[PDB]
Subunit: 85 residues, 2 copies
C-alpha cells in the first residue's frame, strides 16, 4: 500500500491438501443402536441342512439380505450311513 | 314407521354388539401343535465382509454352533504403530 516493494517469493495456491483428515462416512443410514468393536462371529438360528448356497466366500454381506436356506423336516437323518459312494 | 308393526331390513337389534354367528375364514391360529414349517430362509444380522468360511455347502447346521464370521471396520486408520520387536 505504501512505499514500493518487491513481489512475494510465492503467490501460487493449491487445492490438493492432505487426504488423511478427509471424511465422507456420513448419512445413508441413520438410526443406530449402541456400537461394537469390529469382527464378530455369528451362530445359526436353528438346526438344518445346507441344500442350496446363496452367497460365495469373498462376497461381503449386508443387513437385510439373505445368506443361506435350511430345510428342517421332523427329526434329523441319523441311522448309520455317513461315508459311502 | 312408529307403528307396532314393522319389518326388518338387516338387523332388528337384539343383544347384538359383536355379531358372531357362523364364520370360518382362513385359520390364523397354530392350533395346539405346529401346522407347517420346514424350509425357512435366514437373513444376515449385520453388514460385513466374508473373510473366512467355517461351514462348507452340504454340511448340515445345528442350533448353538457357528456358521460365518464378519469384520466390520467403520473407523478410519490413525497412526497404528507397527510390530518388529
Amino acid at each position: 500500500m505504501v512505499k514500493e516493494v518487491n513481489v512475494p517469493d510465492i503467490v501460487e495456491v493449491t487445492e490438493v491438501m492432505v487426504k488423511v483428515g478427509d471424511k465422507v462416512a456420513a448419512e445413508q443410514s441413520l438410526i443406530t443402536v449402541e456400537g461394537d468393536k469390529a469382527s464378530m462371529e455369528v451362530p445359526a438360528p436353528f438346526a438344518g441342512v445346507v441344500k442350496e448356497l446363496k452367497v460365495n466366500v469373498g462376497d461381503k454381506v449386508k443387513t437385510g439380505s439373505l445368506i443361506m436356506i435350511f430345510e428342517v423336516e421332523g427329526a434329523a437323518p441319523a441311522a448309520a450311513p455317513a461315508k459311502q459312494e
